[PDB]
Every structure is written in structure tokens, then in C-alpha cells.
Amino acid sequence: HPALTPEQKKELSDIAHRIVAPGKGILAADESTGSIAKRLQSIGTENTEENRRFYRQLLLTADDRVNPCIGGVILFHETLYQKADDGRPFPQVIKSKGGVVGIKVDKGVVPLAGTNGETTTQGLVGLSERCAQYKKDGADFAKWRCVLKIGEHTPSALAIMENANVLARYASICQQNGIVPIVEPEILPDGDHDLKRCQYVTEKVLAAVYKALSDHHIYLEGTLLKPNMVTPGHACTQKYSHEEIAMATVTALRRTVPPAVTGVTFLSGGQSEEEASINLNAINKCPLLKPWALTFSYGRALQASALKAWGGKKENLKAAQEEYVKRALANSLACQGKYTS
Amino acid sequence: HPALTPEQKKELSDIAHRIVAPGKGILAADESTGSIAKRLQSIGTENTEENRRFYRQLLLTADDRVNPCIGGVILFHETLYQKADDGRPFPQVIKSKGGVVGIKVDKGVVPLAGTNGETTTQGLVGLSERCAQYKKDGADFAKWRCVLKIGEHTPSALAIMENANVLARYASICQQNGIVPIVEPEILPDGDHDLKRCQYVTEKVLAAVYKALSDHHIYLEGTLLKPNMVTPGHACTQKYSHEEIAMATVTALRRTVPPAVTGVTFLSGGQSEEEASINLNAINKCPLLKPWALTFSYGRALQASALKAWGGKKENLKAAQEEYVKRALANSLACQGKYTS
């Protein structure tokens, strides 16, 4: 569509920069019902709209200690339209604490015909209308997740090309509607591959992603990247230090992400809460030159303990918030390379 | 070909870093006979092997004031095999002054069939053998020049793809032979296009170049980029300040060149000696974050006055060297953002 005006670019750049301002990261609370369903059953809690509303309220209304730690919060569409007990729409709750409101806009992963168990992501249909609507309703940034898997002959060239193209189309539509797109090309940790294999694949995928964004004239200063850290496979037989993980990650990014990108907000994948903080901290202590903010966009890494403490019981509200606050503070320090465990 | 070993990567990275070390740039003296022919006729001097040898000797033997300014010198194959009056091979002369020896390995531009006056570059045939030979004979880096032109419907997608692919193939062959490749995708200033048009095309070309390098598994830390600065067309009807030129240039680079690239060594194109220094200085004063050295790889911008002062007369030797030394010092300060005219 038509090229962006100076005003449109300024809006996008300002939004992107506020989300990843020094010491800040993103709370990824955008689990769909199917996704949140599994989280709730793990704590023997009924997956109902009210319990989902209460849980999101619990996270969003944590005390002001999280304000300097949380630059943005990603929501699922249901939550974008829910209200706290005091009548305030959740987007208002988020903004009153200094956070930018985000909205997941993809509609899940689906099989990519002809491939060996590979996938693509659906949701481009009606995306422009949804973005305009979400913008009107309080959201300033969005998120779209694509998944790639490392295997004998995967990810294939077809899968990489397909997913990078979709991310670029999504990003263009977002910017046309004044929304900062967070591009998430997640490479699963599944498999027995080693660290260098993950690094190689990550470099291949990100290169495809940015060429695709270029092809679609995406304003990079008005975007964020949410990639996987470079780690050994979940079934890898070799052990790696946090330093090796940090070096592999920063190197992969330096070899592929243009300096114009405003920030990188890592997903935690299957890492434990502390592991995710330690690795992010190590990434920020790496002496190499890094031209973009290196921070967090964590779901489980910020919520695991809180969800467990809550247990679906209202009396556990404050205890649950405390677990979340502790992780928010930890990661706020980690994205500054100042976290000490 | 086979992936590089840690030793091979270290060699390439070390070479690349020495060439663009703080305050240093490149003297591009790699004019072929046909190219140097026009330079010599401009000063009423016979284009003979001896006059070419004497002129190159004049530049290479300038006094030690150029040592901290010149990190590398690009030569044409003829010169790589010539000797100074004292019997020292020119590569030895260059190295004894702290410079790295470079060698142009492309064999000129030729028409790209089917396009509207567009070109590609020849020389891939036998390139591996030449690189190995040049490495043995003293060269540690190389240069390959591709040319793109801005017009109504140019550069075309075909021309961009073709030239980026050739540069990537050249770069791979260089690294396999221990030579640091300088990738030069020059976008001519010819035409009445404005500054933003040049910026857009430069961004498009560089994005294609780096995707191509990625596709060929090029070790970026062991490479340098020699692009055109972003300027208005030679026949543009609008005037632009040095600040606007610097901003457009740095922005184009930030949007496309991965931080892993060790350095950017600008070509001067048709800019005057002082214009090239002023613009490089402005580029280095730009507050934006720049993860790579921003320096010079100048031919005419370092030689124009020297060639004129020499005039083909041996008695003008020192006067000619002084003209060159003055420009070397100017650009050495410019690549540090410390040049004041």
C-alpha cells in the first residue's frame, strides 16, 4: 500500500522505542483459550471467561514496582475487551501503569501442504480490518507468530520462504494502520541438534525474514523482533554454558538484524523462569556491539510461578502478584546486564 | 565449498579489521590500462607500462605521514607484479608502511542481455585460481565492482538479482582462498533523480546483496562493503546539504547492513576531493548508531590533485606526493569525524 508519511513513521518509531526503553520488556499474556486452557488445568482451575478475566486482572494490576519493568503487554482479543473489577477496560489499566497495549493478531499455526510436518500461520484474511479496529480500541502494537522446526531436512527452503513472506505481509498491514508489528519467527528447541546447528538455522531464517520485510518496504525503526535465543536442542547430548548461549545468540543477531530495528524481545520457549533471566542477562553482558535493545517478551518466564501461586483461589491474589513482580524485576535488571542471582 | 575453520575465520576477520582500523582508509589505485589511460591523457602523459609504474611508485612511496591514514591499497594485477626503483616489489612497499595489499579481481562490466542498457560483471571464470595466486603473491583482500543505474525502470529486479548473486559468488571464492572480499555494488549518480530516490534504490540493492551473501554462507566479519554515498542525481534540480547527504547515507546503511560487517569503505564517485572528505566527515558526525567503521576507499578523491601536479614529469615527484598526502590526512580525519575545512 501507499508509503508512510513522516507523521506515520514518527508514531511507529515512538511506539517501538517506548516498549523497549531501557530496563523495560514485554509481558506476553496473549494466550488463546486453547493455550490458556492447558495453563489452567495445570493448576486445577476451571477455564471460564471469568477465571481468565480474573487471572489477567491479577497480572495487569500488580503493583507499581512493575511499571519501570514493563514497557508493553500483549493481549489476546478476548482480554482487550474485558474490564477490571473497578470497571476500567484492561487497556486502560495497562496504560495507567506506563505500558503500551499489544494485541496478538495471528490465528494459529496450520500445516503447510506438501512439507514434512512443517507449518505456516493463518490470519491474513481480514487482518487490515482487525488492525484498524484494535487501534481504535487501544492497541498500539501487535504480534504474529510463525513456527519453524529443526530436523533432518527442516526447516525447508519452502517453509522459510512461506513464513517470512507471511510475516512481511502482516507487518505491512500493521504499519498501514498505525500499529507496530512484532515479528516472531520462532525456531523450536525440539530435537537433538547442537548449539551451532541452531545458530546456523536462526541466521538462515532471520536473513529470509529481513529480505522479505525489505521486499515489502517495512519501516524497520517501527518494528520489533521476537526471536528464540540460540540454544542447544531439547534432546541435545552436549552441555553449553550461559556464555556460549549468549555468544551464539548475539552473533546470530549481529549477522542478520539491521541496526535500524528498534529492539529484540526474546521469547523464552521452554526455559525456566530463572534460566530465561540468566541467559538474557548474559546476552546483555556480551561485549560485542549490539545496535538494538536486547530485552524480554516473556509468557511462561514471567507467569509460571504466579499461575502456580494463584491456584485459581482468590485468596492467593497478592501472593501470585508477588511471584510475577519478582520475575519482572529480575528481567528488568537482566535486560540491562545487571541481574545477579 | 566447505565451511570455514576457526583459523580461517580469524585470518579473515583480522585482515578486515586492520584495513579499517580507526583513522584508516583505502587508496584505490586499481585502475586498469583502459581506465588509467584516460587519467594519463588528461595530463598529457604517455600511457606506457613505465609511466604507470612510476605513477604507482609515486603514490606508494609517499612519506610516513600516510601510514596512519592508509590501512589498505587496492592494486591492478599489473602493479602487483611491478617493482619500485630500489627493487622492492610494490606489495612489499605497501606492507612496509603498514598497509594491507588488495587486488581487483573482476574483469569489467558487460551488457546484461535483455535489459534496458543494464549491466553485469565478468570475471568469475578462473577466479579461484587467481585468488590463490594473488594470495601467494602478497594480496590479502580483493575488490569486485558491479554497477547499477537509476532510471525510469532501472535498476530492474533482474539486474539487482544478477549482480547481487555475482558478488556473493565472488565473495565465497575469495574467502575460500584466505582473501577478504570487498563487495562493491555501485549505484551511479547519473540521472536527475532526487536524494530519496537514491536512498530507496540503495536500500533495495544492499538488501539484495546481503540476502545473497547469506545464501552463500559468507562470513561477514571477514568482508567489507564499498557502496556509493546516498546523494542526489548528477542532473538533479534540487540542492541538498552535506547533513542531508550524511543522514540519507547512514539511514540507508542502518536499514540494510548487518552489524557483523566489519567496515564500510565509501567510493567517491564523481565527487571532488574536498566534497568527498566533507561528506565522509559528516557521515561520521551523524549521531545515529553505526556498528561498522565508516571510512574511505577513494581513487580520484585521493589522486586527482597528485596526478595533476605530476603531469608526467619526474621533477614534479615530491609536489605530486604532497597533494596525495594532504588528501590522505584529510580523509583520515574525516573517517573519525574530526575533519575541519
Side-chain angles (χ1 to χ4, degrees):
Chain A
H1 254 292
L4 306 173
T5 62
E7 181 187 61
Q8 289 178 298
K9 286 181 174 178
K10 187 174 182 301
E11 169 175 43
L12 294 172
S13 178
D14 290 340
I15 293 172
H17 283 84
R18 285 187 254 107
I19 296 170
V20 301
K24 306 191 181 182
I26 299 170
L27 162 61
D30 60 311
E31 302 87 359
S32 61
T33 298
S35 180
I36 189 65
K38 300 131 66 175
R39 296 292 72 67
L40 269 46
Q41 182 47 59
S42 71
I43 58 174
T45 300
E46 299 296 312
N47 184 13
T48 61
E49 182 178 357
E50 174 53 31
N51 282 333
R52 287 194 298 277
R53 188 198 67 77
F54 189 80
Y55 178 57
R56 270 49 185 280
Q57 171 175 289
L58 180 161
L59 296 173
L60 303 185
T61 63
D63 75 44
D64 57 40
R65 280 175 294 168
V66 306
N67 293 13
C69 307
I70 303 300
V73 180
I74 319 181
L75 301 180
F76 179 63
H77 73 272
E78 175 185 80
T79 315
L80 187 70
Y81 295 106
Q82 292 181 317
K83 299 178 184 302
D85 295 331
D86 70 352
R88 293 191 296 158
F90 284 141
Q92 183 180 335
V93 177
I94 291 165
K95 297 178 183 182
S96 289
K97 292 171 62 58
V100 181
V101 176
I103 178 68
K104 182 233 293 301
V105 298
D106 72 71
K107 290 188 178 180
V109 304
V110 301
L112 211 192
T115 67
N116 185 186
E118 295 188 288
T119 61
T120 185
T121 296
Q122 72 188 321
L124 287 177
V125 174
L127 180 61
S128 189
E129 186 181 26
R130 296 206 298 294
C131 283
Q133 188 66 62
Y134 294 146
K135 181 70 178 182
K136 281 172 51 59
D137 296 331
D140 286 313
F141 76 93
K143 195 213 75 175
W144 181 292
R145 174 171 180 264
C146 283
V147 186
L148 298 303
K149 189 169 184 173
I150 298 179
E152 263 289 62
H153 305 300
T154 64
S156 65
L158 178 63
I160 297 177
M161 188 181 109
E162 169 61 34
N163 283 279
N165 185 59
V166 171
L167 284 167
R169 289 175 60 186
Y170 139 79
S172 182
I173 293 172
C174 282
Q175 301 197 317
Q176 289 291 147
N177 293 92
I179 295 179
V180 168
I182 294 186
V183 49
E184 174 175 19
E186 168 167 28
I187 295 173
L188 299 179
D190 299 51
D192 70 320
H193 57 278
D194 59 36
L195 186 64
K196 302 307 282 62
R197 157 94 285 198
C198 176
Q199 191 185 314
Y200 176 79
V201 177
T202 296
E203 283 174 27
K204 183 177 178 179
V205 171
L206 295 184
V209 167
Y210 282 101
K211 176 52 166 54
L213 297 181
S214 173
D215 292 345
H216 292 258
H217 319 74
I218 300 306
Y219 177 56
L220 300 181
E221 295 88 326
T223 73
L224 296 174
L225 175 73
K226 179 167 181 174
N228 47 277
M229 291 179 186
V230 179
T231 67
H234 185 291
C236 187
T237 65
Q238 307 183 186
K239 191 205 304 74
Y240 297 87
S241 71
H242 295 111
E243 183 172 59
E244 292 179 297
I245 290 174
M247 182 173 80
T249 301
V250 173
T251 296
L253 297 174
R254 282 169 43 76
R255 293 175 175 174
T256 55
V257 191
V261 173
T262 294
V264 176
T265 66
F266 297 106
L267 55 88
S268 63
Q271 301 179 59
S272 68
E273 294 178 318
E274 179 73 345
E275 180 65 29
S277 299
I278 295 177
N279 283 329
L280 176 60
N281 185 67
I283 285 172
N284 274 279
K285 291 182 67 62
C286 193
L288 301 180
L289 191 167
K290 300 111 67 180
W292 355 251
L294 289 173
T295 188
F296 58 98
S297 184
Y298 296 168
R300 280 149 168 163
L302 277 169
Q303 302 177 57
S305 291
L307 185 76
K308 185 182 182 62
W310 171 46
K313 297 178 172 57
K314 143 278 184 294
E315 304 189 314
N316 291 159
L317 177 60
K318 292 186 176 183
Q321 296 181 309
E322 199 64 29
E323 289 297 323
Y324 164 57
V325 173
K326 186 172 182 293
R327 299 323 307 178
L329 292 171
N331 291 304
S332 175
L333 286 178
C335 73
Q336 305 181 69
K338 299 184 182 183
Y339 183 56
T340 292
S341 179
Chain B
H1 254 292
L4 306 173
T5 62
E7 181 187 61
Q8 289 178 298
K9 286 181 174 178
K10 187 174 182 301
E11 169 175 43
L12 294 172
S13 178
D14 290 340
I15 293 172
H17 283 84
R18 285 187 254 107
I19 296 170
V20 301
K24 306 191 181 182
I26 299 170
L27 162 61
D30 60 311
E31 302 87 359
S32 61
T33 298
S35 180
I36 189 65
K38 300 131 66 175
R39 296 292 72 67
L40 269 46
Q41 182 47 59
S42 71
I43 58 174
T45 300
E46 299 296 312
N47 184 13
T48 61
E49 182 178 357
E50 174 53 31
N51 282 333
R52 287 194 298 277
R53 188 198 67 77
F54 189 80
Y55 178 57
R56 270 49 185 280
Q57 171 175 289
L58 180 161
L59 296 173
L60 303 185
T61 63
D63 75 44
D64 57 40
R65 280 175 294 168
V66 306
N67 293 13
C69 307
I70 303 300
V73 180
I74 319 181
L75 301 180
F76 179 63
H77 73 272
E78 175 185 80
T79 315
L80 187 70
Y81 295 106
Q82 292 181 317
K83 299 178 184 302
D85 295 331
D86 70 352
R88 293 191 296 158
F90 284 141
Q92 183 180 335
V93 177
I94 291 165
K95 297 178 183 182
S96 289
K97 292 171 62 58
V100 181
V101 176
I103 178 68
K104 182 233 293 301
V105 298
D106 72 71
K107 290 188 178 180
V109 304
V110 301
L112 211 192
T115 67
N116 185 186
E118 295 188 288
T119 61
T120 185
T121 296
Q122 72 188 321
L124 287 177
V125 174
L127 180 61
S128 189
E129 186 181 26
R130 296 206 298 294
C131 283
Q133 188 66 62
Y134 294 146
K135 181 70 178 182
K136 281 172 51 59
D137 296 331
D140 286 313
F141 76 93
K143 195 213 75 175
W144 181 292
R145 174 171 180 264
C146 283
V147 186
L148 298 303
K149 189 169 184 173
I150 298 179
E152 263 289 62
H153 305 300
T154 64
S156 65
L158 178 63
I160 297 177
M161 188 181 109
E162 169 61 34
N163 283 279
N165 185 59
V166 171
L167 284 167
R169 289 175 60 186
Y170 139 79
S172 182
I173 293 172
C174 282
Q175 301 197 317
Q176 289 291 147
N177 293 92
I179 295 179
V180 168
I182 294 186
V183 49
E184 174 175 19
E186 168 167 28
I187 295 173
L188 299 179
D190 299 51
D192 70 320
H193 57 278
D194 59 36
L195 186 64
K196 302 307 282 62
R197 157 94 285 198
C198 176
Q199 191 185 314
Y200 176 79
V201 177
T202 296
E203 283 174 27
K204 183 177 178 179
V205 171
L206 295 184
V209 167
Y210 282 101
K211 176 52 166 54
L213 297 181
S214 173
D215 292 345
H216 292 258
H217 319 74
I218 300 306
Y219 177 56
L220 300 181
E221 295 88 326
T223 73
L224 296 174
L225 175 73
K226 179 167 181 174
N228 47 277
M229 291 179 186
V230 179
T231 67
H234 185 291
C236 187
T237 65
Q238 307 183 186
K239 191 205 304 74
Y240 297 87
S241 71
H242 295 111
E243 183 172 59
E244 292 179 297
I245 290 174
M247 182 173 80
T249 301
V250 173
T251 296
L253 297 174
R254 282 169 43 76
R255 293 175 175 174
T256 55
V257 191
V261 173
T262 294
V264 176
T265 66
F266 297 106
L267 55 88
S268 63
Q271 301 179 59
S272 68
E273 294 178 318
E274 179 73 345
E275 180 65 29
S277 299
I278 295 177
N279 283 329
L280 176 60
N281 185 67
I283 285 172
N284 274 279
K285 291 182 67 62
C286 193
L288 301 180
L289 191 167
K290 300 111 67 180
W292 355 251
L294 289 173
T295 188
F296 58 98
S297 184
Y298 296 168
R300 280 149 168 163
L302 277 169
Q303 302 177 57
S305 291
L307 185 76
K308 185 182 182 62
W310 171 46
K313 297 178 172 57
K314 143 278 184 294
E315 304 189 314
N316 291 159
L317 177 60
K318 292 186 176 183
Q321 296 181 309
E322 199 64 29
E323 289 297 323
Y324 164 57
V325 173
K326 186 172 182 293
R327 299 323 307 178
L329 292 171
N331 291 304
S332 175
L333 286 178
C335 73
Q336 305 181 69
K338 299 184 182 183
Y339 183 56
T340 292
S341 179

